[PDB]
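Record format v2
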Amino acid sequence: QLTSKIISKFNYNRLAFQLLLNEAPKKYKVYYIPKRGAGFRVIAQPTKELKNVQRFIVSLLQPKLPVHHKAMAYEYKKSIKDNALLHKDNNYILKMDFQNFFNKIKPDIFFSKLENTGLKLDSFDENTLRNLLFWRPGKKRSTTLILSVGAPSSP
DNA sequence: GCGAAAGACACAGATTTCTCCTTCGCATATAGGGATGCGAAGGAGAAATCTGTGTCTTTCGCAACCCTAAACC
């Protein structure tokens, strides 16, 4: 049960929480930041009221989802230095990267992975989770959700 | 992930121009008659270039952001 804990913690009545659930995927702001060189970059960031409930959800789900020990990003007591200490005594090096990594994660694959771990959740939990952690670009009829970056729960 | 506004890609079809096909008319090298060969206009029917339609492609400064220093995504 996750909706009950959120309601209890933030003191939300039924109507206010229903409205927030409906209007959540559109409370984002899009802006540009300069590039080192020539160009620009585009970011999207949620509001203050949604950020502190996303942090709470992350704190609630952190001790139940396994993470591999070879990922040295957004992890406790890990940094660049521990990443570079692995290759400090080897000769040849090869580097690669993906293409639009963040916006290729969709709720279909998130729930597919979540079902395999054995954690069972009701329909209400799935509905609240889907409408709270995902972004909907385009018009109101897009019906497409992506994670984005600049949100405390994406990493 | 993708607003508005112009191009690329694929598939038809259309049209003016031209090039092959009659038809008989001529002609000129052999004393008139006949014949092998070529020239003149219609009359086709073929072909290259142009034009028109429908489905994608691209990537906005895109209601709703914080204000202490450095590095990364």
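Helices of chain A lie at 3-10, 14-23, 48-61, 80-84, 107-116, 123-132.
The longest helix of chain A spans residues 48-61.
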